Prior knowledge:
Chain B: It is found in: Cell membrane; Membrane. Chain B: Belongs to the X(+)/potassium ATPases subunit beta family. Chain B: It is a single-pass type II membrane protein. Chain A has 39 helices and 28 strands. By secondary structure, chain A is α+β, with helices and mostly antiparallel strands. Chain A has 4 domains: 2-47 and 127-246, Distorted Sandwich (Calcium-transporting ATPase, cytoplasmic transduction domain A); 64-117 and 247-340 and 726-993, Up-down Bundle (Calcium-transporting ATPase, transmembrane domain), CATH 1.20.1110; 341-353 and 565-725, 3-Layer(aba) Sandwich (Rossmann fold); 354-564, 3-Layer(aba) Sandwich (Calcium-transporting ATPase, cytoplasmic domain N), CATH 3.40.1110.10. In chain A, strands 8-26-25-24-9-21-23-22 form an 8-stranded mixed β-sheet, with helices on both faces. In chain A, strands 1, 2, 3, 4, 5, 6 and 7 form a 7-stranded antiparallel β-sheet that branches. The longest helix of chain A has 31 residues, at 878-908. Chain B has one domain (1-294). Chain B has helices at residues 19-49, 89-99, 238-241, and strands at 7-8, 13-14, 67-69, 77-80, 113-114, 138-139, 165-170, 199-206, 217-221, 228-230, 250-255, 263-269, 285-292. In chain B, the strands form 4 sheets. In chain B, strands 4-13-12-8-10 form a 5-stranded mixed β-sheet, with no helix packed on it. Chain B has a 4-stranded antiparallel β-sheet with strand order 3-7-11-9, with no helix packed on it. A two-stranded antiparallel ribbon of chain B has the order 1-2. With 294 residues, chain B is of the alpha+beta class. Chain A binds chain B through residues 92-93, 825-826, 829-830, 833, 836-837, 840-841, 844-847, 849-850, 864, 866-867, 870, 872-880, 883-884, 954, 963, 967, 986, 990, and chain B through 24-25, 28-29, 32-33, 36, 39-40, 43-44, 47, 51, 55-58, 61-62, 66-68, 72-76, 169, 171-174, 236, 238-240, 277, 279-280, 282-283, 286. Bound molecules: a molecule of 6 linked components (NAG-NAG-BMA-MAN-MAN-FUC), a molecule of 5 linked components (NAG-NAG-BMA-MAN-FUC), 1,2-dioleoyl-SN-glycero-3-phosphocholine (7 copies), a molecule of 2 linked components (NAG-NAG), cholesterol (CLR) (3 copies) and potassium ion (3 copies).
Amino acid sequence: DLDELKKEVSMDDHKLSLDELHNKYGTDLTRGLTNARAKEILARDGPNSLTPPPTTPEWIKFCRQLFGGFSILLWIGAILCFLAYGIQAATEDEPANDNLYLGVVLSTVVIVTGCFSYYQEAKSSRIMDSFKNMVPQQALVIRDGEKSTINAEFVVAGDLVEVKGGDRIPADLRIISAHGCKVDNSSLTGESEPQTRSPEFSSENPLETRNIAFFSTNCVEGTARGVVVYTGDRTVMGRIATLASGLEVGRTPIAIEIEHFIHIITGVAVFLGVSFFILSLILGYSWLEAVIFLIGIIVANVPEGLLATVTVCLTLTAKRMARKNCLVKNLEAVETLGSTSTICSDKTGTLTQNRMTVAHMWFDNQIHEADTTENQSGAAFDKTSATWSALSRIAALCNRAVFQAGQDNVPILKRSVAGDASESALLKCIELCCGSVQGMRDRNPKIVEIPFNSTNKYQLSIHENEKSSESRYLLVMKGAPERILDRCSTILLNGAEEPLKEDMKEAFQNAYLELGGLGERVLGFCHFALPEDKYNEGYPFDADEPNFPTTDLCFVGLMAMIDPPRAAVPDAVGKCRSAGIKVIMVTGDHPITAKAIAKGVGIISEGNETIEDIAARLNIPIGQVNPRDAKACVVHGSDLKDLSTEVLDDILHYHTEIVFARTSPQQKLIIVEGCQRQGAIVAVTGDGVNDSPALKKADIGVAMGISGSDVSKQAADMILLDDNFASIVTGVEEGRLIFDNLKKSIAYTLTSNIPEITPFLVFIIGNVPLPLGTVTILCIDLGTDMVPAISLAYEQAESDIMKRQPRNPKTDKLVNERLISMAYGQIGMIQALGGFFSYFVILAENGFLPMDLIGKRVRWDDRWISDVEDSFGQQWTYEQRKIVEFTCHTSFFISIVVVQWADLIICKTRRNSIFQQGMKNKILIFGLFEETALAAFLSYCPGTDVALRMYPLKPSWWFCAFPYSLIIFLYDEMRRFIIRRSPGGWVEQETYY
Amino acid sequence: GWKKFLWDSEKKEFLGRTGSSWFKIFLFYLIFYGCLAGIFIGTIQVLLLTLSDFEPKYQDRVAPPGLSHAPYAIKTEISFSISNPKSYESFVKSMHKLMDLYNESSQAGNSPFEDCSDTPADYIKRGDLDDSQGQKKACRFSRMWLKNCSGLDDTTYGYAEGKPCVVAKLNRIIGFYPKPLKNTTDLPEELQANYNQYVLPLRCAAKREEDREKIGSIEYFGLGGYAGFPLQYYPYYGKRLQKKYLQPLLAIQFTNLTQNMELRIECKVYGENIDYSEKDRFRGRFEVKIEVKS
Lengths: 993, 294
Ligand SMILES: *[C@@H]1O[C@H](CO[C@@H]2O[C@@H](C)[C@@H](O)[C@@H](O)[C@@H]2O)[C@@H](O[C@@H]2O[C@H](CO)[C@@H](O[C@@H]3O[C@H](CO[C@H]4O[C@H](CO)[C@@H](O)[C@H](O)[C@@H]4O)[C@@H](O)[C@H](O[C@H]4O[C@H](CO)[C@@H](O)[C@H](O)[C@@H]4O)[C@@H]3O)[C@H](O)[C@H]2NC(C)=O)[C@H](O)[C@H]1NC(C)=O
Ligand SMILES: *[C@@H]1O[C@H](CO[C@@H]2O[C@@H](C)[C@@H](O)[C@@H](O)[C@@H]2O)[C@@H](O[C@@H]2O[C@H](CO)[C@@H](O[C@@H]3O[C@H](CO)[C@@H](O)[C@H](O[C@H]4O[C@H](CO)[C@@H](O)[C@H](O)[C@@H]4O)[C@@H]3O)[C@H](O)[C@H]2NC(C)=O)[C@H](O)[C@H]1NC(C)=O
Ligand SMILES: CCCCCCCC/C=C\CCCCCCCC(=O)OC[C@H](COP(=O)(O)OCC[N+](C)(C)C)OC(=O)CCCCCCC/C=C\CCCCCCCC
Ligand SMILES: CCCCCCCC/C=C\CCCCCCCC(=O)OC[C@H](COP(=O)(O)OCC[N+](C)(C)C)OC(=O)CCCCCCC/C=C\CCCCCCCC
Ligand SMILES: CCCCCCCC/C=C\CCCCCCCC(=O)OC[C@H](COP(=O)(O)OCC[N+](C)(C)C)OC(=O)CCCCCCC/C=C\CCCCCCCC
Ligand SMILES: CCCCCCCC/C=C\CCCCCCCC(=O)OC[C@H](COP(=O)(O)OCC[N+](C)(C)C)OC(=O)CCCCCCC/C=C\CCCCCCCC
Ligand SMILES: CCCCCCCC/C=C\CCCCCCCC(=O)OC[C@H](COP(=O)(O)OCC[N+](C)(C)C)OC(=O)CCCCCCC/C=C\CCCCCCCC
Ligand SMILES: CCCCCCCC/C=C\CCCCCCCC(=O)OC[C@H](COP(=O)(O)OCC[N+](C)(C)C)OC(=O)CCCCCCC/C=C\CCCCCCCC
Ligand SMILES: CCCCCCCC/C=C\CCCCCCCC(=O)OC[C@H](COP(=O)(O)OCC[N+](C)(C)C)OC(=O)CCCCCCC/C=C\CCCCCCCC
Ligand SMILES: *[C@@H]1O[C@H](CO)[C@@H](O[C@@H]2O[C@H](CO)[C@@H](O)[C@H](O)[C@H]2NC(C)=O)[C@H](O)[C@H]1NC(C)=O
Ligand SMILES: CC(C)CCC[C@@H](C)[C@H]1CC[C@H]2[C@@H]3CC=C4C[C@@H](O)CC[C@]4(C)[C@H]3CC[C@]12C
Ligand SMILES: CC(C)CCC[C@@H](C)[C@H]1CC[C@H]2[C@@H]3CC=C4C[C@@H](O)CC[C@]4(C)[C@H]3CC[C@]12C
Ligand SMILES: CC(C)CCC[C@@H](C)[C@H]1CC[C@H]2[C@@H]3CC=C4C[C@@H](O)CC[C@]4(C)[C@H]3CC[C@]12C
Ligand SMILES: [K+]
Ligand SMILES: [K+]
Ligand SMILES: [K+]
């Protein structure tokens, strides 16, 4: 699957002849292939079906999640536990089973976290399947001179294939004979434009010529014949589907951030481990003691509950987004939005409302205004000229939409109309001041209609004339004003006709620019009376050859219409500009209108200017001005069809407000691939399959939901349900919000690591009784700290997030050294000191003063010394001193909770004060209450000395950690104060996360 | 990367900062940690002011006294060959370490030792737990009281010919008064004979019913010839108020011990404020695994 040979622009053999192509495929133009030859090729080339994707079994990635940084350390912990158990079982009789339990539990922790990571790294991709639902089941092939419908997979290169309006093109064909055949290249051109397929050649670009039908498209109307030039994975839609399924996924920003800290955490873990293991044997420690050490140190360093906290945090924000109408398929896409700095959106159906209303009209060299208000409370437009009547007949006849059955009750403007928004707006205006269109339509029977063509750029039809004294034929046609202007020679002025001298041609140009500058879309309507002498009432004008005079028509007048903007569109554009997200308008209407919509939504800020605007303000040629004095620019599609790569790089590198008009959504992908290249996260907004290769390679693909197709939505990462644009801004804000909270929660979880690491370290350097066991640790990181860390996600904003520029990926991170200096360096140190305080207090009250504790470990752990003298001379048996050590573990754990109170409060806000933000987060309050209730339950419940080894505490001990907690609160409060008064100083570049 | 983040020569940076940054960070951490240390020390000094020097505030984790012995057994087993002398050396070195503290040379003069009843007697209260009266006085405990296990005659103490000794001792507790069982109809079988109220009885037996026969004649040595501890050596006033204090001892000779076979012997003290524990196998009683393999 060579990607570079698939990234290249398609080439072809279109510029050929009918004789030169059969030879290339061994076929007959009037008899097709033979059945024997057909099967010989069917076996030579393979079936005409897209290849299935390479797949990934599920136990592979689950087993992968079981091996990754924190899990390897916990694995070596379980292994060590079983090693120490084996040693005990082979060296001593009646071996307590404490170590085997601790090991089975560590293995359980690894197994469950794995599940949380599997849930986070999901890749729900069924691309090729959506594509497979494309190709009809059976095609119509002509072999040996006979017509047969065979399994499309059985079509080969060379046979003759016939198509009919409504059927799907089974392969890439070379049209040989057509009969008014039209195709819908929505998949390559991105447009529902009905391109006609003619046997003749018309453009050097194979995608633009008409003598080629393409797989993945459908013949809207007409019938055609053709030779098969491409089949299978080689068709056009074949490179589209193979390219979509082939793109290596990669690694989202939040993933790279989660990797960076596992690296740092592991650094301090191995540094402390290999070093103290060598130290343990440099001091004479035996093997069964060093193994216990190693384990305690590994558990102490690894935050056994973090990763699962992150996975939850992210799940909560995804539910908030679904409440705001943004549904996310992949968990990490929640954060990719905040880190975005470039957006490629569309104007039709997202910014605008697409609901069209008739605003202005041109006729009798005079602009007329129509009432465009809900309750119809305004000014009429003078319905007394014949011109208006002819206009009503043109629009009311040359229009295929009709009100939805059963609307006889609603008003003329609020009823449902089945069709495009332009035909609907025209139908409503005619039904508004011209009465019932249904009778106006039955009053003139439509004989033949030639639907809209992407090449003809017009809709025409010849209906009968209701004239009782004139039994002739009427022809009407509508289309772009330029195309229609080129097809006339008379003008219906006040009823009579007149020539098309340049005076009215210039009045028509000024009228076109008047309606265009108003942000409206204009259309031209013309008609002509066919002479009944050259086309009698019996002659049938089949839509095949030139039966109607394309030129010499009678232009009656232009018809504009309004598409207003959405409520939040101006606000959303302002929000994007405030944040620093480069917006890029890509649409498919005329640039004269595109500029107006740009000025109307914000893309072109009130003040910026284009090179043409400067040339017009200084009435000088455009080749003289310097392109650096122009902030914005309107790039045309044709000029995009003929543009190199580096040029596009410079186009995006030198302009802040770019707008692309006359663009075929194919080119879109090109612009997206040009936006990612410079170094910025890219999002995109799409609706169909032409956007599939663009949504897949973008950092984040935003697909529409109501108007979008299964292919586009199933291949994207984020789906919108209201098709609005304000939701994009909301997504970016929520992506930032869930980021600052992850920082706070990480500092939280980390801070308590020091009070768990230090007891062990003093255990080896000073030789004092073990202060904090391993079971107590697991009870701290897996118990009391989970709920608070989860609550830290519900924190609201402090300042304005939608105002700062996007974070830099190469310099700003998630876990820097500032946080390490706070959690590991300052707060954690105070918490460790408080724990040691409560420790020494418990031992001093029972008889072991601090001077006699240094050096006692060798005998304090000796299981056969039933006489250990304390500071007062009392003799303590082994189990009696062990009970006190366990009670010291219980109080150490409670001290941890007490200091965690002030840590959760100083972690709530990063800069602001508590008396400003406020304790409005009910989850945090519930976390504190539950955190205390759990510690009291674990200590006071009967039988906890048989299970967890935790004895009850005497009410005077619980108050040994209070001063340290208040001190932590005061220190962080004064910390978060100099930052506010001294911006850019020492406290900021040293302690500001 | 590798080289630059280590030492660049344009900005004169090492590891990432200049000399003034490393100096400001180091100075800050030194002041911060210094304040932390001073605060912890102050909070520990107030703690030294909150406790008394003559008595432990909490005495509940040591209410039922233990029962230890003189030999140091790794797994509560005494195994030694009567031929190879380098087999019972680790034991004798201990026994000796324990008895070496009851030497008469140590116990001499009026201060701080006092001659007490050669026959078991009652308690003796030397006042309260104060410093008003000077260093209290403790009763003298002679070596010779232990007759065949004293290391004065047969230094080895028995281990030389298949007749080891075991010096039992009651764990020292401040203000603890031993209370023996009264003469009422409910009393164990053993305790009936020789009910000297003033003596806390110690009696050893076999863990299993079978082993009875294989254990021979348990001969106890003690103050007055009884198998117990005289109440006159109580209570204990603590190290600070009674340095140079000796706790009674009881010797136990396991004469007539079957050869080449593991014997489980459980010794137990009886009394009111004495209670055993199924978890702590040294609370009031003790177990020994003797095996004189020769
Ligand atoms: C408490 O009392 C201990 C015993 O006291 C003895 O008996 C009491 C009743 C009094 O009569 C007292 O005056 C006695 O001394 C006392 O321990 C004793 O200390 C002495 C002095 O070091 C030891 O003498 C040395 O003996 C060794 C060999 O010892 C063998 O036997 C012992 C067991 O008894 C084994 O443990 C050894 O391994 C040996 O198998 C001699 O080699 C050594 O030679 C030295 O002296 C000679 C002159 O005699 C010189 O020529 C040499 O150069 C050496 O300098 C000594 O003769 C005696 O062994 C030891 N007894 C025991 C049982 O260990 C103890 O110190 C007192 N403690 C306190 C705190 O008061
Ligand atoms: C602790 O307790 C024992 C037992 O006390 C006895 O049982 C208690 C449960 C309770 O009911 C007491 O009231 C009760 O006395 C004390 O030892 C006992 O002492 C008596 C008296 O000497 C002994 O009785 C003797 O039994 C002999 C045969 O076994 C008999 O020949 C003796 O004759 C003597 O008395 C008669 C009058 O009855 C007199 O005519 C004789 O000339 C001779 O003096 C006598 O009846 C018990 O056997 C003893 N019990 C045991 C187990 O030995 C013990 O003294 C006491 N200790 C203290 C310090 O108080
Ligand atoms: C008995 C013992 C008990 C101990 C108990 C305490 C337990 C230990 C507690 C914490 C362990 C700390 C471990 C070290 C942590 C360093 C953090 C770290 O490595 O983070 C990584 C950062 C990267 O950051 P970034 O991505 O933003 O970079 C962007 C750069 N761009 C953008 C320019 C390219 O790299 C950097 O910071 C650069 C690396 C700096 C390394 C400094 C090493 C200091 C370590 C020890 C000093 C001890 C001296 C003591 C004596 C003092 C004198 C009296
Ligand atoms: C010696 C012992 C040392 C102990 C050290 C550890 C201490 C840690 C524990 C508690 C610290 C408490 C700190 C008190 C802070 C109070 C701050 C405050 O009051 O700021 C007022 C705010 C600001 O309002 P505003 O102007 O923005 O409103 C605008 C309203 N508009 C919009 C309608 C106009 O008002 C609000 O936040 C709204 C009202 C919120 C009321 C919160 C009351 C609950 C406070 C604490 C819960 C207790 C936890 C106990 C844990 C122990 C468990 C056993
Ligand atoms: C919003 C949602 C709210 C939900 C709140 C839920 C709160 C749940 C509240 C209570 C349920 C607690 C479980 C009940 C345990 C009953 C245990 C029991 O009745 O034991 C009695 C006997 C003790 O007998 P003894 O005195 O003769 O022993 C003498 C032993 N000598 C002499 C050798 C020392 O037990 C024994 O023997 C053996 C002891 C067996 C140990 C079982 C303890 C389980 C260990 C850890 C699980 C705790 C996890 C925390 C869950 C928190 C949920 C919030
Ligand atoms: C926010 C949610 C709050 C709720 C979370 C709960 C908080 C605690 C969280 C984790 C604690 C895990 C620590 C593991 C400790 C195992 C201790 C152990 O194994 O000690 C070994 C003992 C020794 O017994 P022995 O042979 O001497 O007995 C002889 C009995 N004779 C002789 C009388 C017959 O054996 C025994 O105690 C046997 C009983 C085994 C005890 C298993 C306890 C498992 C505890 C937690 C696992 C579930 C947590 C899931 C919640 C996740 C929250 C996100
Ligand atoms: C910024 C940091 C904030 C820190 C807040 C800390 C809050 C601490 C909360 C409670 C303190 C623990 C409770 C103390 C209970 C001790 C019970 C006890 O058994 O005590 C006895 C000892 C005295 O023994 P002795 O040998 O002299 O007796 C001699 C007797 N003869 C003369 C007859 C021989 O008592 C003593 O040591 C008492 C000495 C205690 C001195 C420390 C004072 C603690 C400061 C404030 C407490 C909080 C109250 C106000 C709350 C305000 C809320 C906003
Ligand atoms: C049981 C646990 C107890 C824990 C108690 C801890 C108490 C210790 C608290 C603070 C002591 C540390 C003071 C360190 C002072 C020397 C630092 C120094 O050399 O700094 C130099 C800078 C001035 O350089 P520059 O910025 O002009 O140069 C610009 C440089 N360029 C351009 C690179 C940005 O200094 C500055 O900026 C000024 C910043 C000074 C730092 C203020 C931090 C105050 C924090 C806490 C005090 C509150 C204690 C409350 C306790 C209540 C107890 C009940
Ligand atoms: C990175 C994490 C660091 C974690 C810090 C852990 C702290 C513990 C570290 C080692 C503990 C060693 C044991 C402490 C005992 C010292 C003994 C002592 O000193 O006995 C002198 C006096 C006692 O006198 P007495 O004769 O009246 O008592 C009894 C009188 N009788 C019995 C005759 C009645 O004790 C006194 O005065 C008070 C002395 C209390 C000892 C505090 C010394 C702590 C040293 C540094 C801690 C600061 C750490 C800052 C973080 C640095 C990170 C680099
Ligand atoms: C010590 O134990 C021995 C047995 O090991 C006892 O002596 C035995 O007595 C039986 C008669 O009951 C004789 O058949 C054996 O020949 C004897 N053996 C020996 C080695 O003498 C002896 O009575 C016990 N002595 C004490 C004081 O308990
Ligand atoms: C048990 C005792 C003696 C250990 C004391 C270890 C102390 C001195 C260690 C623990 C964490 C360390 C700090 C952790 C993080 C940073 C940030 C980095 O960019 C420079 C080094 C610096 C500032 C370290 C300096 C030394 C430090 C404070
Ligand atoms: C606000 C902070 C920084 C103040 C900290 C003050 C520290 C440095 C003070 C508070 C209490 C003081 C100690 C209290 C008690 C004693 C015992 C005495 O026999 C010698 C001095 C000594 C050892 C003091 C040394 C200094 C000390 C620890
Ligand atoms: C603002 C700051 C400096 C105040 C710090 C107050 C310190 C000195 C107070 C706060 C809590 C107090 C301790 C709390 C609990 C106990 C247990 C009790 O059985 C004896 C007193 C003792 C050991 C206290 C000693 C003094 C103490 C540590
Ligand atoms: K941990
Ligand atoms: K994608
Ligand atoms: K932790």
